[PDB]
């Protein structure tokens, strides 16, 4: 299965 | 630890 | 469209 | 709620 | 390459 | 400003 997996990030 | 989960969809 | 939806998790 | 919209990009 | 960027949202 | 990067991935 397809998933997104990420971060919070400050920019 | 925060992290993202998440889907891909259709909209 | 694609988009992504997700939630900000604890890990 | 807190949640998370987002694109799928070519970077 | 394929990536995700978003955006923390209220809903 | 706080922003979402993440990876698609297949689990």
């Given at each position: 299965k397809?998933?997104?997996?990420?971060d919070?990030?400050?920019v």
């Amino acid at each position: 299965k397809v998933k997104v997996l990420g971060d919070v990030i400050e920019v």
